[PDB]
Each structure stands twice: as structure tokens, then as C-alpha cells.
Design a protein around this nucleic acid. Sequence first.
RNA 1: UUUUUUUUUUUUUUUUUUUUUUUUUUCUCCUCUUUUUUUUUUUU
Length: 71
Amino acid sequence: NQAAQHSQKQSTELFQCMYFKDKDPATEERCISDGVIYSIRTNGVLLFIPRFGIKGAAYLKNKDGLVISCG
RNA sequence: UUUUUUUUUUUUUUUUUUUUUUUUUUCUCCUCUUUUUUUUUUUU
């Protein structure tokens, strides 16, 4: 059963990974999401998507230390 | 008015046999980063 669990998990993960495949995410209106947080880490705060349901740790600090501002 | 003679196509056939796919080289080798590892639950 635990193996089955992992199977559903990574199967749906792979199915989601192709939703974000090569088909150009630049002019088809399937690009912008929203975001809330739930936990802070020392380089990027954990993000969440209420409209799809995906998680993942992002980064504010980038490789070249070029930290973010906004216009 | 121009007679007579000068051989030709090698002889032979009534011999035994108890093996066996292939075949014979090439060295040690830096796997990058949010994690502990999540977990009940119900509709297949």
C-alpha cells in the first residue's frame, strides 16, 4: 500500500509536469498563478498554489547574489 | 607405246578407411543543494 501511495504521487506529479511542458507558455493564457506562503527558509519561502495545488521551495537569493527588488 | 610394290585407330581393372558447435585479451573511472522523509480519512 505504501508503494501504491508513492505510485499515485509520482504519477500525478509526472502528469502535472507535462501540463507545464514545451507548448509555449508565453502567448497561451496559461501562465500566471497566485501565491500565499506557509513557512520561511533562509533563501526562499515555501510557496503554494490554491488554483492547481502544487508546492515547492523557491529562491529569492540567486546564484549571483542579485537579490530582488520591484519597479 | 608408260608395268610392279610400299601392315594399322594403348594393353589393364572384381580399391580398405573406426569423426562432430566453438576455437584466442584491453585499464582505473567526483551523479550539485528547502528538508525531516509524507503517511488517518472517503468516494475506483
